[PDB]
């Protein structure tokens, strides 16, 4: 009856009783980190809350109902969907233009939770026209607390890739990200770059739109930002770009991206080490001049070091970086690899339980021997000298057909 | 026009031509990591591939069509959905008992991709009865490559939490997980434990089902498995369980769980350090006996060391672990923290950008001073000697109202 009385009092003609009841509902949803959302929905309070959103004559009541609806929309998809089905979104879009700042901001917060539910709720709110008035809040005078909520909604607008947001929405969001990437607040900068990382993870056409925005020269130097939160997001965003074409990759390289990577391969955090090698693996998958840029940047010995001593996640990306180079590189670039003693630590990975890593190393060794027309003898002994030949022989006993067939063909052709 | 010809030939009365056409379609989907799924869907080949699944008179064609449909279902949700709307699932389910092993396995693979799309497709395949014949494949004679695909589908049956799988499905899966957790293959062990981690992240009632299965005494010792992939999955699974009630937490503790954590707190991997402290923070949020078990296991000095010298992700969990203890512990248990020199590294976190961490530390300091009846003076001196008092005073000017109000209350009450 406590919940039932609160619902009845939320429709009271007495304004003091009505405001107190909506507050009591809000506090049930905000007093702890396990709110009773389903109980309040079944009590019948949703249509009353959506209804208080129209009370322009009582801003205090509008604010409390928007707060209560914000927390209901923060729950499961079914609970977020109940707020949608109550037709609250058109009223939240109304309140973006409220003269009262706390009402306007809470409506942004509520819409962000609905947008964050998934692509279909995102596209419903987009269809009603949320993006333009949202970006209109970006101004010199906006409070910093409010702007952090605005950039959080922008992240939610970019974050679902199945499907990505419509192209028109991306073309509206990108000029706003170009403004925000120069902000000195760390949280806004982190959100801005994560938003870019979601847009660059959406395919090559979206990558080109990010490039055409002109934002890449202002993104690459963030690889050496003091804050590791910014570095991690920037490494992800530029890492996604270099998954595109050779030209798109060259744009990132022409912003001096490789200069930042000595400090990234030696960074304290293993996660940055792994993503940095993953980045480089996509450069050694490029053309021969991009392979040469990695060589000229003196990054190969640091890759081979992590291939040997790094954690298994990083060693895995390092094997890809080496194996990619054996497919794209010239003979003199692969010879540079042999001179840097890639053979022993490369072969040491042949005994791991990850069948993909074993296949990557076997593919690389096959390409190395096929490429060294005259020096295949020297390389063949180097492989046996470190115990690699013994490991190739036992991989003939492997469960995977692609692996044991390649082990057979390697020994027949070169041993 | 080659695509149109392949589609035409896929309906040929000439069995050689039909098999080659379906093969050519499969090849387009399997020859690289960027298959043209949309082109094949638009070509009209889906209902022809589905009809090939009915050809019990040609197992080779059945296998090739199942492989082709497997890869279409491995794409976007709309592409997985196009296979569903072609009514392929009932035919895949009847192919689970084909006399031909390769046809059977490929049907399991295709169904796993549909289940992996989301909860709605998962429940559709469950509604048609996939779980029982899937688990019937678990036997002493099953080839290990097939078993890894069965356990992967079992992971996909457990992986979505909005909503979780039906209770009836979980009760069917748990006895299979009890069998597989004794397997010696690492990949099957890792899949089995990750499936448990998904089930234990689904709420306290699913946690009780996992406990009632009797599998916890066989999960906890995997915290010290030789393979770090197993340790990581096991730490996640037992970590989810201790997010439940005090009784559910005590089940894990009575399996000697805390004896594994010295090696987890000093492990080379930072992520193991962080999630191990997260585990311990949920133990210090328990009753006073569980707080005492952490003290008796000699873990507090190791927590305080990581609070001082760990990466920031681990420092946050350590701040939670200390702050949780100040709420639940006795006075002699909090006094033990002071003797273990908690004050300096605890206060040193007051200057981080994470507003949640600052709130956590202020809450802990306030709780410490309130429970030190006479020793509030000694502790107040310790807080100022390390610079903590200076940091609390400047937090009175913080942009967060919860933070600066508590900063004032601490100074008003104790300084």
């Amino acid at each position: 009856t406590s919940l039932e009385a609160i619902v009845q009092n939320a429709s009271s003609d007495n304004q003091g009783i009505q405001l107190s009841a909506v507050q009591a509902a809000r506090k049930l949803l905000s007093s702890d980190r396990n709110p009773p959302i389903d109980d309040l929905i079944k009590s019948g309070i949703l249509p009353i809350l959506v209804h208080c959103l129209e009370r322009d004559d009582n801003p205090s009541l509008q604010f409390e109902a928007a707060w209560a609806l914000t927390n209901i929309a923060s729950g499961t998809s079914e609970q977020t969907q109940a707020v949608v089905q109550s037709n609250a979104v058109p009223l939240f879009l109304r309140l973006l233009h409220s003269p009262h700042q706390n009402v306007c901001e809470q409506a942004v917060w509520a819409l962000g939770n609905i947008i964050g539910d998934g692509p279909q709720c995102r596209d419903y709110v987009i269809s009603l026209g949320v993006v333009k008035p949202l970006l209109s809040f970006i101004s010199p005078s906006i409070p910093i607390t409010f702007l952090r909520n605005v950039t959080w909604v922008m992240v939610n607008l970019c974050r679902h890739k199945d499907p990505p947001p419509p192209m028109e929405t991306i073309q509206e969001i990108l000029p706003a990200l170009c403004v925000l990437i120069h902000h000195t607040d760390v949280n806004i900068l982190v959100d801005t770059v994560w938003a870019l990382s979601y847009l660059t993870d959406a395919g090559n056409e979206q990558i080109q739109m990010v490039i055409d925005s002109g934002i890449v020269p202002h993104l690459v130097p963030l690889l050496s930002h003091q804050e590791v939160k910014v570095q991690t997001a920037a490494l992800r965003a530029v890492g996604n770009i270099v998954t595109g074409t050779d030209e798109q990759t060259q744009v990132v390289l022409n912003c001096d991206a490789l200069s930042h990577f000595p400090a990234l391969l030696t960074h304290p955090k293993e996660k940055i080490n792994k993503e940095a090698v993953w980045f480089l693996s996509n450069i050694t998958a490029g053309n021969q001049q991009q392979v040469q840029a990695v060589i000229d940047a003196n990054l190969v010995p640091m890759i081979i070091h992590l291939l040997d001593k790094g954690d298994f996640g990083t060693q895995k990306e390092a094997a890809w970086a080496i194996s990619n180079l054996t497919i794209s590189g010239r003979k003199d670039q692969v010879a540079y690899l042999i001179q840097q003693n890639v053979i022993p630590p490369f072969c040491n990975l042949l005994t791991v339980k990850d069948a993909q890593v074993v296949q990557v190393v076997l593919d690389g060794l096959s390409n190395i021997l096929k490429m060294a027309e005259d020096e295949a003898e020297t390389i063949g002994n180097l492989i046996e000298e470190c115990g690699g030949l013994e490991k190739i022989e036992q991989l003939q006993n492997h469960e995977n057909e692609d692996i044991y067939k390649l082990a057979y063909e390697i020994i027949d052709q070169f041993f | 026009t080659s695509l149109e010809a392949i589609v035409q030939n896929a309906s040929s009365d000439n069995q050689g031509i039909q098999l080659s056409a379906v093969q050519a379609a499969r090849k387009l989907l399997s020859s690289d990591r960027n298959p043209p799924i949309d082109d094949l869907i638009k070509s009209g080949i889906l209902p022809i591939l589905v009809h090939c699944l009915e050809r019990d008179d040609n197992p080779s064609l059945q296998f090739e069509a199942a492989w082709a449909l497997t890869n279409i279902a491995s794409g976007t949700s709309e592409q997985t959905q196009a296979v569903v709307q072609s009514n392929a699932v009932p035919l895949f389910l009847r192919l689970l008992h084909s006399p031909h092993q390769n046809v059977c396995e490929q049907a399991v693979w295709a169904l796993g991709n549909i289940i992996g799309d989301g909860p709605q497709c998962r429940d559709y395949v469950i509604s048609l009865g996939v779980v029982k014949p899937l688990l019937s494949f678990i036997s002493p004679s099953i080839p290990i490559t097939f078993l890894r695909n069965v356990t992967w589908v079992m992971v996909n049956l457990c992986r979505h939490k909005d909503p979780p799988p039906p209770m009836e499905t979980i009760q069917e899966i748990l006895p299979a997980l009890c069998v597989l957790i004794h397997h010696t293959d690492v990949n099957i062990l890792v899949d089995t434990v990750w499936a448990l981690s998904y089930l234990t992240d689904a709420g306290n009632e699913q946690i009780q089902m996992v406990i009632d299965s009797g599998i916890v005494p066989h999960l906890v010792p995997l915290l010290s498995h030789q393979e770090v992939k197993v340790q990581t999955a096991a730490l996640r699974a037992v970590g989810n369980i201790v997010t439940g009630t005090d009784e559910q937490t005590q089940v894990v503790l009575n399996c000697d769980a805390l004896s594994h954590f010295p090696a987890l707190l000093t492990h080379p991997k930072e992520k193991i350090n962080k999630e191990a402290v997260w585990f311990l923070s949920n133990i210090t949020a328990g009753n006073q006996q569980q707080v005492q078990a952490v003290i008796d296991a000699n873990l507090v000095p190791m927590i305080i060391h990581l609070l001082d010298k760990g990466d920031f992700g681990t420092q946050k969990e350590a701040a939670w672990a200390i702050s949780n203890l100040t709420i639940s512990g006795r006075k002699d248990q909090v006094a033990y923290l002071i003797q273990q020199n908690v004050i300096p590294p605890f206060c040193n976190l007051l200057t981080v950008k994470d507003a949640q961490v600052v709130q956590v530390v202020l809450d802990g300091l306030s709780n410490i001073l309130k429970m030190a009846e006479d020793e509030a003076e000694t502790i107040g001196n310790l807080i100022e000697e390390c610079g903590g008092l200076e940091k609390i005073e400047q937090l009175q000017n913080h942009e967060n109202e919860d933070i600066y109000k508590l900063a004032y209350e601490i100074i008003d009450q104790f300084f």
């Binding site: 927390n71 964050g116 | 996640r236 949920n282 949020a285 949780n324 709420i327």
Partner: peptide
């Protein structure tokens, strides 16, 4: 006092947020 584990993606970019009191 119990806290569920938040993934790395939800750590730096939480999809949904309730406003706490």
């Amino acid at each position: 006092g119990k806290r569920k584990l938040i993934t790395s993606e939800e750590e730096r970019s939480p999809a949904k947020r309730g406003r706490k009191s």
